[PDB]
Amino acid sequence: NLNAVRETMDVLLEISRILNTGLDMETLSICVRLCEQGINPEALSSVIKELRKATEALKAAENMTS
Amino acid sequence: RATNAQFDSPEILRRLDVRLLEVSPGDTGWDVFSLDYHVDGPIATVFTRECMSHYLRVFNF
Amino acid sequence: LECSWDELWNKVQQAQDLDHIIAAHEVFLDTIISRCLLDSDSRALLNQLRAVFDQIIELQN
């Protein structure tokens, strides 16, 4: 049921907000879809963390170069 | 051991403990440190789970 | 915290039955939670106190 899927995505977003994960609704839905495809959640979290670390390092380097 | 808490009875001191909440990145110790008091048996009828949660909340604050 | 704990202990020492002790300890814990802003109704006060503590920690740092 589309409504149940929407509620599930809203629940995931609310958990991320309580946990202050800084995930938007789209990234959360992508992580959910990848987990549903059988991607290991620890691997998915490690990929997300590495991408976040790389983005923070890039933004910090740009802010030091601007 | 460095403070007057060392002079408390072993039965009291054994119940005073440090609890660490689930550690998240960016959290400080102020957000996760609490004292707790384990209540069981007949005393758990007076020190209910609600009462113990309230005591732990006051301790952490 | 200290006053509500002393009240709990005095009530328990004055308790005539187990249900009286349970009720007195529950009331004491609820009073401590409310005045320490740890109750459900004081949650806004607790959040404001936590924000004050966070700003105090930021100032300290």
Added chain:
Amino acid sequence: PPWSRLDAQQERDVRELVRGVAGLQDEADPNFQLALNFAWSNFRFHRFLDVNSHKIEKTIEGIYEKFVIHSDLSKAASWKRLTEEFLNAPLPSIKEIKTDAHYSILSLLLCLSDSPSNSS
């Protein structure tokens, strides 16, 4: 072969994740390809255990306790309610409740948590 489509979809989803989180919109950027290859490598060659629902529940309860101890009873209640709802909610691909996808999502959120006791 459907294996190749599943792998291609995983690689696409990881690439979109890298695009969204890292801001690397251009797939020709070597940092984008490095992140995509790292993601696909971790998804295909992970050494992680399957999601343990009880572990996710315990992390949710620990965050609830953390918020309660911080006297953020509203945050504690919201965290507990939302995590229970998610564990009881269907996933986009999986209609069943309390599926491995649900516990995987909760594990991800717990790993992504940032001081849940101190958050409003």
